Amino acid sequence: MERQLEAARYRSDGALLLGASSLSGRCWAGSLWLFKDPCAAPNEGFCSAGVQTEAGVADLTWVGERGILVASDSGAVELWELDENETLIVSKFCKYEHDDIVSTVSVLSSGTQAVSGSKDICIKVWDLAQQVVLSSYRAHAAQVTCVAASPHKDSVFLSCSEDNRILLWDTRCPKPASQIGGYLPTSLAWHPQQSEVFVFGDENGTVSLVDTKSVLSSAVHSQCVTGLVFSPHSVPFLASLSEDCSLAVLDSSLSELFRSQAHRDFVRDATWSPLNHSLLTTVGWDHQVVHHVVPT
C-alpha cells in the first residue's frame, strides 16, 4: 500500500474508505481500500477490499454505499464500485476529460451527478449513470483547488481557485457562477444545518464563516488549511486539518475546542464516525490513521 494517505471517508454502516498515493519513488501510483474494521487501518493484511489505480489519487468521495469516485493525476475521473460481496473494488468507468491533474471531486445531492475540479482550470458536471460530461465550465483563471456540491441543492455547489475567487454555482442560471466576496482559498465546507452558510480556509491558515447574504474568522492553523469537515451533531463541530500537521476541532463561533498533533506529516483528510459522533478519524502522508475522541 502506498505511503501518502490522501483521503478517508466513513460510510453509513461504518466502513472506512482509504485513498492513498505514491508521491515518490519508482512508481507514482495510487490505491483504494475498504476497512470494515477501522482499527485495522492502515494495515493492508487486515482490510476488506483493495485495488491499485494506474495513477495517484488526488481526491475521492463515496457515491452511495458501494461507489467510489476518484480524481486521478492522469486527468481522468474514475468510478469504482464494490461487488455484491464487498470483497472486490472493480472500476466502473475511466474518462479522461481533463487536461491536467484532477484535484477535487464531489457528489451532488442526488448521488447521480458529480462536479470535478482540475489544474486545467476547468470545472465539469458529470452524469455518473451515462458516464459523460454534461457541462464544461472555465470560470476561473488558475488551478481549481476545491469543488463542493450543495448538501441539499442539486444544482448549487462551491468552488475556489488560485485566482483568489470563491464562486457560488447555480446551474439554473444563464451565467451559473457568482463571485462571493485576501489570501488564496484552499478548502470549502457547507454548513450541515444552514444550507446558506459555509466556511472556507485560506493558505494563510485562516478559517472563515460566510453567510449567503453578502463575517467571522479565526487564525486556526500556522499553514495552509487543507480540509474542513463538519461533525454530524445537531449543532456540528468544525474540524480543520492543515499542512502544519495538526488537527483542530472548532465550535459554532470558530473557537478551538480540541487540538491534536499526533500526525508527523501533512494531515490530508478527516472523517467523523456515523456510529460514534465523538470519534473523528484522520489520515496523513505520514501513513498514520489516527482515531481521535473529541470531548462533547
Binding site: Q4, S21, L23, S24, G25, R26, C27, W28, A29, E54, A55, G56, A58, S72, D73, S74, G75, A76, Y96, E97, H98, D99, D100, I101, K119, D120, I121, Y137, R138, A139, H140, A141, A142, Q143, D163, R165, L167, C173, K175, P176, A177, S178, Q179, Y183, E203, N204, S222, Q223, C224, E243, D244, C245, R264, D265, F266, W285
Partner: protein, 614 residues
C-alpha cells in the same frame, strides 16, 4: 521533419511512459522531476523532517536519456511570489531544489511558467541559480499568448468579461515575459515557450513576439478541431501561426489528454511538408562587413560574388544599353569604346563587358584594374588563355593608376550592403580624372536605406560579442552583415545616403548627415536599424537588396546598426534616428543616434569602435 515533444504531469513509471511517448513519435518528454502534488516543507517541523527519497532515482534512465529526452518541469505548487511569507520561503527552497536536481541530471532544458504579472522573486531565484556556475542548461518560460483571465468563460454573473478592446491590455503576457528577462539581464539561457489557446488574439498581440527567443510552441490537444474523417486539425488561423513558427524552427510541444477517443503529431508533419532557401544557415548569423579596399579578399570570397548570374546579367544589360546609346549604328565597325573595370576581381565584369559588346554589335577596348594581387593572378591566367590582347589587366589602385587614355565607360562593383560602406564614392572619385568629359559611370548612382527593427534575439547576439581587449560596449558601435530573420521591421525603409557618379560637383564632399523619422504603429522595443541599398547601373537597369524592391540576386545580405540600450516605443510614436557619414584622410566611418521618442548616445563617436580603411 518537425521536432516535437510530449508534455505530461502524470508519469507512473518513466520506463513505460517514455516508451509509449517514443513509439508514438515524440522526440522528447516534458515531465516533473518531483511528483507535482508532492508538496514539501523546508522550515517548519515536523513536516520538514519527511524521510526520503524525495523523488525518483537518476538510475532509472541512462545518462544519455536525461541529456537528450527529458525536459524538467517546475512543480505547480511552487509559488516564489506568493503573498504569504512562509509560502515564498518554502517555494524558494523548493525551486532551487528542483532546479539543482534538473542540473544534477544534466537535463537539456527546464520549464517554468509565467502565469501572472509579478514574477520578481521567481526571476531572482532563477538568476541566482544561473549564476551558480557556467553550465549549459536551458530554461523555457511557459507564457500564454492570451492570459487565462482574458479567455475565461463569461459565465460569472457579477464578474462580466471585458467587451471593449484594450490594445495594450491584450498584450499583457508579453509584458510578463519582458519584465522577467529584463530582471534576469537577458540571460542567453532563458527562452520562451509560447502557449497557444483555442482562440487567437489580435494580430498585434501575436506580432509582439517577433524577434523574441521562441524555442518552443505549446499546443494543447483541446485547441484541435475534427474533420469529417474524425482526425484532429486546426483552424486556418492556427495553421498560419504554425507556419510562422516553422520559419523559426521551434520545437512544438503537445500537452493535454487525447480528446479524440499520435494523430496530433501526424497533422503537424502533414503541415510541415505542405509549403514551398539559398542563405539557409546564415539566419541571424552576425558577420563582419567586408572591406575589399583595406583587405584583400580571399579566392572563395570572389567565388561567391561570381555564383550570381542574375547580378552580372544586369551588368551586361546595363553595358549593352550604354554601348548602343554611345555608338551610332553608322559607326559599329569604326568606333571602339574604352571600358575600364575598376575592381575587376577575378574577371566577371570583364566577361560581362565582352558579351555586352557582341550583343550590341559594337567594339570595345577593355582595361581590368584590380589592386588585389592574388586576384590579378586569376585575371592574367584568364587573359593569357582566353581574353588576350583585347583585355589589358592593370594591377593598381584606381585612385593612383596613371591611365594611358580616358574611358568612355567605367564599370565597378564597389558597393556594399549599405551602399557606400566599402568606400565606393572615394574610389570612383579618385578614378574620375581619367573619365572622358562625356563618360558614363556604371553604376551611375546608389542609395542606402534604413529601417527600425525589433529583435531581442539579435540584440543579445550583439551583446555576446564583447572581447577581452577593447571597449566593453564596442560590439554595439559597429555594423554587422547578417541575414536578418527572427526580427520585426517597425517602419517602412527610407533613403539615407545617396551618391552620384560621375560626381561633377565643385565641392566633392562625401561626408553626410541625415535625419529620419519613422512612424511606428505598434508597441515594440527598438534594438537597431536594418540597412539596405539600391543602385542604378545605367537607366532602368538596377540592383537592389531593398525588400520592397529586391532584385528578383542571392548576393548582399542586410546590414545592422545596433544601439546599446533597447528603446521602448509606443504605438503611434515616431522613431527619429540620426546617421552620419564621417571621414578623415585615413578612415571613413558611420555615427548614429536616436533622438525620439528618447535620446540614445551617439554611437561610434570619432570611429573609436569601427572605421573603414581608406
Amino acid at each position: 521533419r518537425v521536432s516535437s515533444g510530449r508534455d505530461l504531469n502524470c508519469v507512473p513509471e518513466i520506463a513505460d511512459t517514455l516508451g509509449a511517448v517514443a513509439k508514438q513519435g515524440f522526440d522528447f518528454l516534458c515531465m516533473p522531476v518531483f511528483h507535482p502534488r508532492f508538496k514539501r516543507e523546508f522550515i517548519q517541523e515536523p513536516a520538514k523532517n519527511r524521510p526520503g527519497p524525495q523523488t525518483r532515482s537518476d538510475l532509472l534512465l541512462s545518462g544519455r536519456d536525461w541529456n537528450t529526452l527529458i525536459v524538467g518541469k517546475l512543480s505547480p505548487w511552487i509559488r516564489p511570489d506568493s503573498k504569504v511569507e512562509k509560502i515564498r520561503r518554502n517555494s524558494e527552497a523548493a525551486m532551487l531544489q528542483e532546479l539543482n536536481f534538473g542540473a544534477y541530471l544534466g537535463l537539456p532544458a527546464f520549464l517554468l511558467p509565467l502565469n501572472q504579472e509579478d514574477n520578481t522573486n521567481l526571476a531572482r531565484v532563477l538568476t541566482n541559480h544561473i549564476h551558480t556556475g557556467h553550465h549549459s542548461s536551458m530554461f523555457w518560460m511557459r507564457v500564454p499568448l492570451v492570459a487565462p483571465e482574458d479567455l475565461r468563460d463569461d459565465i460569472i454573473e457579477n464578474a462580466p468579461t471585458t467587451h471593449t478592446e484594450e490594445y495594450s491590455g491584450e498584450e499583457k503576457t508579453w509584458m510578463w515575459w519582458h519584465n522577467f528577462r529584463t530582471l534576469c539581464d537577458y540571460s542567453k539561457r532563458i527562452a520562451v515557450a509560447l502557449e497557444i489557446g483555442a482562440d487567437l488574439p489580435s494580430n498585434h498581440v501575436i506580432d509582439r513576439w517577433l524577434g523574441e527567443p521562441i524555442k518552443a510552441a505549446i499546443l494543447p490537444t483541446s485547441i484541435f478541431l475534427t474533420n469529417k474523417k474524425g482526425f484532429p486539425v486546426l483552424s486556418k488561423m492556427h495553421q498560419r501561426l504554425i507556419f510562422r513558427l516553422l520559419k523559426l524552427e521551434v520545437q512544438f510541444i503537445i500537452t493535454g489528454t487525447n480528446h479524440h477517443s499520435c494523430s496530433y503529431l501526424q497533422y503537424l508533419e502533414y503541415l510541415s511538408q505542405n509549403r514551398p532557401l539559398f542563405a539557409k544557415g546564415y539566419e541571424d548569423y552576425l558577420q563582419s562587413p567586408l572591406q575589399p579596399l583595406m583587405d584583400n579578399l580571399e579566392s572563395q570570397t570572389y567565388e561567391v560574388f561570381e555564383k550570381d548570374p542574375i547580378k552580372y546579367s544586369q551588368y551586361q544589360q546595363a553595358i549593352y544599353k550604354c554601348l548602343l546609346d554611345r555608338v551610332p549604328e553608322e559607326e559599329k565597325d569604326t568606333n571602339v569604346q574604352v571600358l575600364m573595370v575598376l575592381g575587376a576581381g577575378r574577371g566577371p565584369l570583364v566577361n560581362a563587358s565582352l558579351r555586352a559588346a557582341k550583343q550590341a554589335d559594337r567594339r570595345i577596348k577593355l582595361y581590368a584594374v584590380e589592386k588585389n594581387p592574388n586576384a590579378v593572378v586569376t585575371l592574367e591566367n584568364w587573359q593569357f588563355e582566353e581574353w588576350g590582347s583585347q583585355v589589358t589587366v592593370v594591377s593598381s589602385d584606381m585612385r593612383e593608376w596613371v591611365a594611358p587614355e580616358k574611358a568612355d565607360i567605367i564599370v565597378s562593383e564597389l558597393l556594399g550592403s549599405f551602399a557606400d560602406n566599402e568606400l565606393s564614392p572615394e574610389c570612383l572619385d579618385g578614378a574620375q580624372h581619367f573619365l572622358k568629359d562625356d563618360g558614363v559611370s556604371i553604376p551611375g548612382e546608389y542609395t542606402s536605406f534604413l529601417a527600425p527593427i525589433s529583435s531581442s534575439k539579435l540584440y543579445n547576439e550583439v551583446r555576446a560579442c564583447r572581447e577581452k581587449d577593447r571597449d566593453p560596449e564596442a560590439q554595439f558601435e559597429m555594423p554587422y552583415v547578417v541575414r536578418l530573420h527572427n526580427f520585426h521591421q517597425l517602419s517602412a525603409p527610407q533613403p539615407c545616403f545617396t551618391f552620384s557618379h560621375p560626381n561633377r560637383d565643385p565641392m566633392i564632399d562625401n561626408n553626410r548627415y541625415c535625419t529620419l523619422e519613422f512612424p511606428v504603429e505598434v508597441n515594440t522595443v527598438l534594438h537597431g536599424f536594418a540597412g539596405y541599398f539600391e543602385t542604378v547601373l545605367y537607366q532602368d537597369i538596377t540592383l537592389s537588396i531593398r525588400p520592397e524592391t529586391h532584385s528578383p540576386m542571392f548576393s548582399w545580405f542586410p546590414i545592422l546598426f545596433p544601439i546599446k540600450q533597447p528603446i521602448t516605443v509606443r504605438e503611434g510614436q515616431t522613431i527619429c534616428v540620426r546617421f552620419w557619414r564621417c571621414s578623415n584622410s585615413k578612415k571613413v566611418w558611420y555615427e548614429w543616434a536616436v533622438t525620439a521618442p528618447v535620446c540614445s548616445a551617439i554611437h561610434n563617436p570619432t570611429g573609436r569602435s569601427y572605421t573603414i580603411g581608406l
